[model samples]
Target: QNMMVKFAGFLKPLKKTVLAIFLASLLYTALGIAGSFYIKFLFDDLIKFEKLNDLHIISAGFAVIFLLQIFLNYYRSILVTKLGMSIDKSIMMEYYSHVLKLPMNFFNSRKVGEIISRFMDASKIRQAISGATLTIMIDTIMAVIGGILLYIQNSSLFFISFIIILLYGIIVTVFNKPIQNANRQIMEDNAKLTSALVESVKGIETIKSFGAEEQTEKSTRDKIETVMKSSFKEGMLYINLSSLTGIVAGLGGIVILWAGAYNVIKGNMSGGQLLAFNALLAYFLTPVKNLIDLQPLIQTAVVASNRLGEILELATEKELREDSDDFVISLKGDIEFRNVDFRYGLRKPVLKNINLTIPKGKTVAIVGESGSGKTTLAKLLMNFYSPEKGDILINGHSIKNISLELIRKKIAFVSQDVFIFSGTVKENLALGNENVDMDEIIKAAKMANAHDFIEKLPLKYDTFLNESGANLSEGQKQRLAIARALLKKPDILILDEDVTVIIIAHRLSTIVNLDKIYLLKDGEIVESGSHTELIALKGAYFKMWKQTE
Candidate 1:
């Protein structure tokens, strides 16, 4: 019932289409029932009366009714198709847009392929709505109408058929558990296979480097076999249910035929009446079989809807309140961390009680070996994550009071792994500052030492970059990233420890001239001084210098 509510919410926007389909279905049902009645009339009235004129007129009437039904069915098909596409589009857009705003931890905890599987799962729900659910409703209507007509013709025969339907329903319900279990296993196996395939393909280079191709292939083959086994079981379950329903229908038909013929022999019924009664019985079975077949589809839809709801209902990352007036404008980079502490979940603290400061327009370098919370500090300054204890202040305003977007807009970050998007060189550089002038772009690139190679390209700034900048060298990609950061003209620029040289520039001539430097060790700032002062101290800074030499 909860799943139905969720599904109806998705369909709310298509209420008009829903109404159209219902009206068309109602018309179609009326035509179908009319056809059954006409069949009775042809046998019991036209043939019994043996009037040639009546036969021609009644046959023409049946033709007109069928023609009208065909037109309505086609129109209904168009509406249904449009409704399905709209639902798919709207649900996908809502899911995708919400996912983009989810907290980083959500992505961190979930597999890429698992998320992709959720996307494909949505289509299954769409199928259930557009096909199974609608068909079931239509079938129910036809079945009821057919049953009423059958009862009118012969109550005893109707009673027998109803008993058959009840037995069929019981059997279908009994098989639901096993069928659902098989489908659940198939869904799980499919996710596993998709995740494995994605990981193998993404890590293909690493696999080959280690000569684990055969091993990876075997693992994938195993997943495929697992999926196939469950899917085959599910298919068999459907086949068995279908066969059961078919047998029940056949037996019911035989019983009805015998009873109707016996009545006719007793002169209580006519031959034409028996034929009409059988026609209604066929209509009754059509919907019964259709409704029974819908069980698996309904199960699939419920599972898919639950999975989609899980992601959609998750708490998104907190964004700055729009009504707040404490949003920062142009930042004066005076950042001060007062006894801040941090951690990832309940794990050991990543950053212990720490304090630091960086004044506006000042270049401060955070140097430390990996995993020492150096990057975490930079992230805190950008308001990516709040400190567990104490507060970070920007220009005497606590970061918690200021908008996160405002804080980040004033800070430029250049990490070790440079991400170059697939587009023209200009597009990549202007990611942060889309409105930047061409001259400004060139100047920024020159500052980052990327303009030289960019100019050498045949397309220059217009050169197309593939995913991860596959066409460019590592140094070139890094330089382009730096150029992108430079174009932002941020109030505070944060770079990784080793990012001082390489694609950026000559360290001694450029980074050493920065206002101040801090050497971080074990999530704490242990040393801080200018270029000359830090070297003279001959501590951790001096050790790092010697290693560089």
Candidate 2:
């Protein structure tokens, strides 16, 4: 499908404004072409020694058309940009909503950093409309029509312009593929740099800890160099295309003038006729030059639109219908994974016949050595991933039959990363639960033992946090995540992430106050107890515990 055409589908709701723009383009081209005829009349009449009144009238008509062109150009610019901004704004909002509703699998497979093209691509869609492309459309139309008029004026002269145009087609055929291909390579290079840059900054602390900043910096520099090299290639190609087309267009004008001057000498046409015809000839070729000048912009934008177009074509959250969880339910935990089985991307089942039954308000510790199906089990309960062979019941209702939104609202999971948003400390604590008051936010922070850390900041709860909590210590960041998760007032909370979960098994079992611990080995419940009870069994859990100590 033409991604350019997909952009036009948005023009429907703005038909009235777009209609005005079309009319303006039509009138602008007509007045522009009419000026050539104006020049002809003024030249022919001046040669005949016409009266002052007749000259002023023709000249006055020319002035009026010229003035209108100026006004239309200014106002049309306003509308085009106005239309441009609003369309990009509206389309991006639609895209954001669409993406938010997509399954986690979609995001896991696609890098948000690179698909930031979904964001940058929007403005190109805007540029395709506002970058004088519509004007190019009308100008080309009038240029072609003006070609017929020029032919009627002088068949031999018209062929000179005609042959130049044919040569233009050949140049376009030769250059189009290379330029477009080069531009695609540039887009790819830019995306690679974006992804690398984002990951590098995000994992800056890890890189430093591993003493790998030198390696990381070298890799990132290579990506930037790749982008720079690709940009140079694309830029040089454009420069060549632009200069080549401009030279041919300028020569076409000179050749027409040279031929017209000779035709006058032979008595084949009058001086006025020759001058006016050349004047008419300009109207035919000027638009073609404009079209040529805009070629690279159009091609690059088309590439952007196709990139964005792929995202727009994806399915939204409504992937469920008819058998939809149309109603919200108040859940009280009661999670049970009945003979659950799961695997990622068709690998052998990692969680084979796994079973768990944790009732309302019960906090369970899922214990295993690293990579022993801990996070996978937690993620299944959080509804991030579904079990392949068994049903997960929340409050006796299968999660498959419950709305994902409602399930999340009742059960909050605080993942290990402790990702922090850039905002005031209060805002991070309150997060999505917007109805929360200052008192409630403070209470939640206090409960999570993060209130003192927040209060020590320059502005207390209102203190601003930089990206990834660059200003806060690692422990302080974890405190903020816990506070925010607590503020959701979830009926059930899963803290099966990172040190919080580990510390319970490795250090302070009493502090976490976990109701029970289920020890997993290769996704099987090999051991089950409460804290010290597992160690007493002297099984896999005891041996792992002894090794860690």
Candidate 3:
């Protein structure tokens, strides 16, 4: 009901269109039932030579009926398919827009499997409008009509057939809970299995560094085994349902045929009546399978809605950042962190008392050992993480006063792990900024020391790169990312934004320039000054300096 009701809006304006489908469905079902109804008369007419003289014309008419039925069936299918595409298209567009504005943290935690899972679930909602539901309506109507005709032929046989039909329904109802549980378990187990496998594959280098393959395999084996076990159990339950239903259906058919034959011998029924009853029953029998399978179909849609609703309910970063930008502020890139304190997930503060300043056109470096909040400092400046105790002032105004969009456009943070999407190398560089100019792109690559290898690539800048630059080494990827950021023409002491260069590092290679260097330790800035000034302190900065040597 939840899924159907939510999908109802896509149908509201298509009333006249779908009404055409309903009428077509009704006519198709009526024609199909009439074909079966004619079977009894066909047998009687042939035995008595009632229409033998007119057989040529009657045979042609029957062909026309079947051909018309064929046309109606396809017409309904074509219309319903277009209807399904309309719904899925709307959903895909809406989902893309919704995901675009989410905070980085939202994607950072979700991982690849669930993002793909959400995609498929959104796709699964399209089936709600498929001709399957129309088939359901038509099947139930045909079955009802068939049941009435069976009673007219022979009440005793009708009662037996009715019992078998109810038996199928009862069996479906009884097994639904276990089947649903198994389905849920299998879905969850598969998600965990995917994450486990992804971790193993992505971390193979770390896993191999210490000969930890055996241990890694051991860790992943449990999830894999559980996934297999859940799937096996689910399959076995299905096997059981099909086996039981098959036996019941087979024996019920035998009983109905034997009873009908005996009544014919006893003169309680005519052969034509028995033949038509069986033909009509055949129609009900095939559709009965879909009737039982409908449970999963509808349930999948309901569960799909529930899963997507969970994401839609989350407030986007834009939603939470609602405020006015009415204050007069220039776009110069001056930045300051006034006693800023911050952390992620309310954990230990990753940055504390970070008082720093970057003049509008200067470059600055944040250096320390790994986990010294060097990256956290950059994130806070971008408002990816808000300061807990203090505030960030950009051009002497709070960073909050500026839109996140403007801040991100100006500040480029190219972390050690650079991100490259699936595209040609030049597209990766420009990143959809349609002002594609070859000279500008090559210019940035040359500055970042990346042009040498890019030229060596098979297609040069036009070479196709795998997602996340799987084809490039870490250093090469970083250089390309630097080139990407540079082409943006930005600032705020970060990447290629000409105004400022803010570099976060696990090394000292990028900070040898003449501006300023801040030495960080344990989320606190211990020393601040020019590059040589911190080296002169001979403290944490000096230790890292000696270590780099």
Q: CA lDDT of each candidate?
A: 0.78, 0.76, 0.77
Candidate 1 C-alpha error for residue 160, in Å:
3.5
TM-score of 2: 0.84
Per-residue lDDT for 85-160 in model 2, tens only? 8888877887777778877778888775766755766677677767765756587787888888998898888899
Considering only N, C-alpha and C atoms within 3 Å, which residue pairs clash in candidate 3? 490-497, 491-497, 493-500, 493-501, 493-502, 494-502
- Backbone clash pairs for candidate 1 read none
For model 1, the local distance difference test gives 0.78
lDDT (10s digit) by residue, model 1, range 476-505: 888889888888877677776311211122
How far out, in Å, is residue 485 in model 1? Answer: 1.7
Candidates in descending TM-score order: 1, 2, 3
Per-residue lDDT, model 1, residue 62, is 89
Clashes of each: 0, 0, 6
Tens digits of lDDT, candidate 3, 1-549: 544575688678777768888889999987876665356666767557866657666667778898999999999888888878888887777666777777788888887666656666677678765836587767787777766776777788889988898899899889878877877677667667777787688767788898999988887888889989998998898888888888888999999999999999997989988897897687666677667766666655666666666676677887777674856434566688888888787677777777878766776777777677876776777888667789778777887777876777766677656888898988788984778678898888898899999989998888999867888988888888888887877766454224766766556776788488888887887888888877777877777888788
TM-score for all models, in order of appearance = 0.86, 0.84, 0.80
lDDT score of residue 285 within candidate 1: 80
lDDT of 3 at 103: 78
Off by over 4 Å in 2: 26-65, 110-112, 156-163, 205-217, 243-276, 316-322, 346-349, 497-515, 529-538, 542-549
